[PDB]
Amino acid sequence: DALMVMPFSYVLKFLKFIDTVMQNKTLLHSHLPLICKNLFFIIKFNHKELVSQKNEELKLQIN
Amino acid sequence: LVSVYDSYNPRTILLSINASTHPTHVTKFHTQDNKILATASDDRVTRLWDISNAYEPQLELTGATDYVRTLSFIPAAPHLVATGSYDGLIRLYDTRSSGSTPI
Amino acid sequence: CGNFGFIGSSNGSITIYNMQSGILRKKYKLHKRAVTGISLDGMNRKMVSCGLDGIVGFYDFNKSTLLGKLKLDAPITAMVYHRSSDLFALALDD
Amino acid sequence: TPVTLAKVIKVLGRTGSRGGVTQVRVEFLEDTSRTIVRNVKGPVRENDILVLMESEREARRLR
Amino acid sequence: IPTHAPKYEDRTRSEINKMKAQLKKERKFTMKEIRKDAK
Amino acid sequence: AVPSVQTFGKKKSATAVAHVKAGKGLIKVNGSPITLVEPEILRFKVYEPLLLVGLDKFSNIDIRVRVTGGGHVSQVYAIRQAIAKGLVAYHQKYVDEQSKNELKKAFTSYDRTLLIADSRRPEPK
Amino acid sequence: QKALPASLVPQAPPVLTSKDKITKRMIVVLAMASLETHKISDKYVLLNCDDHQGLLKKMGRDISEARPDITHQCLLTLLDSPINKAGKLQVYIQTSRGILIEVNPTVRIPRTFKRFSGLMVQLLHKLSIRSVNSEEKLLKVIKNPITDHLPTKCRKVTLSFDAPVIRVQDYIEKLDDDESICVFVGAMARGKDNFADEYVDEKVGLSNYPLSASVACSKFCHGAEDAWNI
Amino acid sequence: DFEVVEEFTPVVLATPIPEEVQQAQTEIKLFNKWSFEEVEVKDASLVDYVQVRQPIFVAHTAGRYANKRFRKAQCPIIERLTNSLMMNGRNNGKKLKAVRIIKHTLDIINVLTDQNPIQVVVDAITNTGPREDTTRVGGGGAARRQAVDVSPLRRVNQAIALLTIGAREAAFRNIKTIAETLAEELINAAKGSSTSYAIKKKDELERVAKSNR
Amino acid sequence: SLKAGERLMEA
RNA sequence: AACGAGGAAUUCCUAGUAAGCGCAAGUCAUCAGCUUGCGUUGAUUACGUCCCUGCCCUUUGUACACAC
């Protein structure tokens, strides 16, 4: 319900946060399940508008 | 004032247009169109009301001199109003113009 | 479905009789020569006729409209309708 | 003052809004990408059109 | 505009109404006391 | 013999008995022609099935309805229910099944309450 | 070039009551007024600050708060102003407790305060006070809220000190041709200026200095008369 | 040249049924005069909720619209206007009185403004439904109004309420009646002519919302 | 006290 | 001489419901200063939410997969 409440600007901020986690790899492995579940749920909700967006920073971040 | 209501029903005053405080002698409906009434008075002006918007004269018509008491629309032209005053001098107005002055 | 019978006469007319009570319902005047073939779709949806003025006429049947009017060259002497594929065949006179 | 028509998609739940005010997510109609979180007043359901006067202001909670 | 003044602050009729009120009140009270005693 | 069929119609406390039999195309209600239904605004509420399915299907049968009970609006609603059910029952028995089914489609797609009443029973929560 | 009206006799303009909701006018709502009625014992009486402070203290309220004299003089200057003679404003007293009081523009107020206090207790208990000609009710207690009893197309503004000062003739001439104006005037002795924030559209001020409420009403009224050419 | 013939003999019912009735049989019209074709909801977001897609004869459809949550929305619009017109204190339970008044009002609307009375009604509704309202914040000692949007069912409810309330208040104490004043009201609201209670009240609501957004 | 969702948004 | 639909406060109500109308009975308690049946016409708005005022439950999975 929380991840459904937040809007798309905060979705983008969330993706930037997960990028910073992947750079801080030990947080990633210590909290690997939760991060995966939240990321996949946010993208499954917001897939339409996120794929509507055209942004090379989004492309590189998601890569 | 003029009182416009349907024939065959004296009970229902359908609309009451308060015109000038001088007595309105002649009150006609249009011939081609059927939502525009035109009435004169001893106020020496003839006002064209539109009976949907019966609060303000849609188009006032002045430029006469004394006691407008006759008026007539013209068959072919649905915009041209002849108005017979009381000093002679039959005026001919075109309503899609300004209308303050006779044509 | 077994409810309707179409009779195409030798002056163009199509009369549509109910078969339980054998009572007349309609009449379709598209042709003016004879009507040498009638058929109805399996969905009761469309209805084809073909007649000696070289004319195929595709009517609707749930509405009562005309969908199309094809004109071939020769007269038309037979029509066979395959409903499972919605293809009919017309034996012509060329 | 151009009014915009948006389309209610998802009636958000478990958000604590005041009684009689229901949060909602709308997709823009003339542009099939953007999504905006707004508040409504009466009865609202999904897939239905909503008129926005000020289109860019995203809605926050009402406690 | 016209103006108006406000208003702020029969003996036989008054005494009639006071005696009617007395009769009503004492009659009702005596009936209640009779019925209490009877029960 | 003569083909005939009897049907019923009910709003709250109104009863409508309709006998439809073959004939010359005349409708009566309670000893009066159908064009004298007294609530006078709801006469078209009585005319609903007649104009929904047309005037030929009525032009070849005689209908006779008699109503009692109820009040003005409930009696109008009982009349129209009895007429519609009598028409479709006659078209099933003495006329054919296709016409019956297309009448049911027309009547239902307009207003189901011409055929099957909705008894407004309570609901305790 | 322009004919005269047929009638040139002077006729009184019709009294503007709460029943009619079209004609453009001005409304003054003396809000947060202090009109309480107490019972001493054999008789009821309106609370005044100066004379009865031991029993005001027995209530426990503020002698600074309970002052009806300023509402009295506000009512005097309002209903004696020329725009009341022209019949273009009406007033409503919004008591601090919650009463709505409609005051018709025709009433002639007694000017000595003891007579006014007797009038006020008779009003706040009897709920209506009729004229001596006795065909009309001048002082009518009516029901909350004022938005339910106001004109339909109105502007509701507060008289606050901290708002930027404007010119009242400029504001009134800036108003539309049928958009009436309603001024909320704080009839408190001394206090905060934020009581009608759910009622009003905006706050305005009239001087860099604070005013008495009667002077504020007089300023707004004379600017309104100057605008509407009286 | 195509021709479909499903009529073979003239239909003469032995009970005489009049020509205007047989024309209604040709086409269902409201009160046997006003058609429902060429009647569009001029604004989207109300295509679903203003129901002019099922033609009707008289405005006394009795059906249970008060059970689910938007069956009210599926109810046809002249019945909504009718029930709101019989909503009063002394008019509670007189649908035939309300229907007679509605019929006379559509007569007046046709006579004055020659287009279509049902179209004037629908334009009135979609022009006076308010678009942005305010709700009072809780606060806990200090409350102000926060601006929110308003949903199409609430807009149609509010529109019909403002129309009938403005009419009843307008001919409360006059020498006019509810039919005359409601015809005047509907015509002005369809014009958007800013001299009707509906347009004034809607513009006030939206103005306050735009103020304290 | 902000709900979950609101607290995640602020953080 | 009172009186023009009745202030502040407080209460009640979600469909044949609120409200209007009448006809009838007088059933061992109650009821005639009225009570109880019966039909008639018959809507506006919510049908969501725990944000406020309350009330209530749980903080040990036990119940046997799978998932959490």
PDB file of C-alpha atoms (C1' of nucleotides) in Angstrom, chain J:
ATOM      1  C1'   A J   1     -54.250  41.703  22.108  1.00  0.00           C
ATOM      2  C1'   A J   2     -51.275  37.203  20.111  1.00  0.00           C
ATOM      3  C1'   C J   3     -49.602  35.990  15.501  1.00  0.00           C
ATOM      4  C1'   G J   4     -45.904  35.595   8.967  1.00  0.00           C
ATOM      5  C1'   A J   5     -43.141  27.795   9.326  1.00  0.00           C
ATOM      6  C1'   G J   6     -40.414  29.064  14.605  1.00  0.00           C
ATOM      7  C1'   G J   7     -32.938  30.971  17.899  1.00  0.00           C
ATOM      8  C1'   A J   8     -29.017  28.650  20.642  1.00  0.00           C
ATOM      9  C1'   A J   9     -28.607  23.818  21.791  1.00  0.00           C
ATOM     10  C1'   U J  10     -30.078  18.643  21.603  1.00  0.00           C
ATOM     11  C1'   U J  11     -32.140  14.068  19.241  1.00  0.00           C
ATOM     12  C1'   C J  12     -33.524  10.529  15.360  1.00  0.00           C
ATOM     13  C1'   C J  13     -33.103   8.156  10.455  1.00  0.00           C
ATOM     14  C1'   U J  14     -30.385   4.390   4.743  1.00  0.00           C
ATOM     15  C1'   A J  15     -35.712   1.627   0.485  1.00  0.00           C
ATOM     16  C1'   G J  16     -41.602   0.411  -0.406  1.00  0.00           C
ATOM     17  C1'   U J  17     -37.120   3.746   4.153  1.00  0.00           C
ATOM     18  C1'   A J  18     -38.227   9.475   5.546  1.00  0.00           C
ATOM     19  C1'   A J  19     -42.703  12.181   4.728  1.00  0.00           C
ATOM     20  C1'   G J  20     -48.371  12.932   3.346  1.00  0.00           C
ATOM     21  C1'   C J  21     -53.263  10.749   3.462  1.00  0.00           C
ATOM     22  C1'   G J  22     -57.254   8.393   5.168  1.00  0.00           C
ATOM     23  C1'   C J  23     -60.517   3.543   6.568  1.00  0.00           C
ATOM     24  C1'   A J  24     -61.200   0.068  10.649  1.00  0.00           C
ATOM     25  C1'   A J  25     -60.893  -2.441  15.264  1.00  0.00           C
ATOM     26  C1'   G J  26     -60.813  -1.369  21.235  1.00  0.00           C
ATOM     27  C1'   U J  27     -59.067  -8.842  22.001  1.00  0.00           C
ATOM     28  C1'   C J  28     -57.998 -10.663  30.748  1.00  0.00           C
ATOM     29  C1'   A J  29     -51.597  -6.254  30.832  1.00  0.00           C
ATOM     30  C1'   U J  30     -51.610  -0.974  28.465  1.00  0.00           C
ATOM     31  C1'   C J  31     -54.923   2.326  25.767  1.00  0.00           C
ATOM     32  C1'   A J  32     -60.115   6.671  25.042  1.00  0.00           C
ATOM     33  C1'   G J  33     -56.707  13.635  26.760  1.00  0.00           C
ATOM     34  C1'   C J  34     -55.513   7.549  23.073  1.00  0.00           C
ATOM     35  C1'   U J  35     -53.527   2.883  21.549  1.00  0.00           C
ATOM     36  C1'   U J  36     -53.009  -0.846  17.707  1.00  0.00           C
ATOM     37  C1'   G J  37     -53.897  -2.718  12.910  1.00  0.00           C
ATOM     38  C1'   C J  38     -54.846  -1.911   7.426  1.00  0.00           C
ATOM     39  C1'   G J  39     -54.280   0.029   2.673  1.00  0.00           C
ATOM     40  C1'   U J  40     -52.928   4.456  -0.416  1.00  0.00           C
ATOM     41  C1'   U J  41     -48.840   8.021  -2.931  1.00  0.00           C
ATOM     42  C1'   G J  42     -43.764   7.605  -2.172  1.00  0.00           C
ATOM     43  C1'   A J  43     -38.291  10.333  -2.630  1.00  0.00           C
ATOM     44  C1'   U J  44     -33.055  13.431  -1.402  1.00  0.00           C
ATOM     45  C1'   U J  45     -28.075  11.463   0.223  1.00  0.00           C
ATOM     46  C1'   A J  46     -24.155   7.550   2.117  1.00  0.00           C
ATOM     47  C1'   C J  47     -23.532   2.300   0.865  1.00  0.00           C
ATOM     48  C1'   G J  48     -16.882   4.373   1.567  1.00  0.00           C
ATOM     49  C1'   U J  49     -13.505   5.253   5.839  1.00  0.00           C
ATOM     50  C1'   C J  50     -11.080   4.365  10.589  1.00  0.00           C
ATOM     51  C1'   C J  51      -8.837  10.794   9.862  1.00  0.00           C
ATOM     52  C1'   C J  52     -12.023  12.757  14.835  1.00  0.00           C
ATOM     53  C1'   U J  53     -15.197  10.631  19.304  1.00  0.00           C
ATOM     54  C1'   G J  54     -15.857   6.090  21.190  1.00  0.00           C
ATOM     55  C1'   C J  55     -16.075   0.806  21.973  1.00  0.00           C
ATOM     56  C1'   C J  56     -13.762  -3.969  21.262  1.00  0.00           C
ATOM     57  C1'   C J  57      -9.945  -7.698  19.999  1.00  0.00           C
ATOM     58  C1'   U J  58      -4.663  -9.547  19.395  1.00  0.00           C
ATOM     59  C1'   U J  59       0.414  -9.303  20.305  1.00  0.00           C
ATOM     60  C1'   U J  60       2.866 -17.703  21.235  1.00  0.00           C
ATOM     61  C1'   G J  61       1.158 -19.143  13.371  1.00  0.00           C
ATOM     62  C1'   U J  62      -0.036 -24.486  15.567  1.00  0.00           C
ATOM     63  C1'   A J  63      -3.652 -25.112  11.577  1.00  0.00           C
ATOM     64  C1'   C J  64      -1.026 -30.391   8.192  1.00  0.00           C
ATOM     65  C1'   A J  65       0.787 -28.454   2.833  1.00  0.00           C
ATOM     66  C1'   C J  66       2.438 -23.855  -0.488  1.00  0.00           C
ATOM     67  C1'   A J  67       3.679 -19.008   0.243  1.00  0.00           C
ATOM     68  C1'   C J  68       4.576 -15.135   3.864  1.00  0.00           C
TER      69        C J  68
END
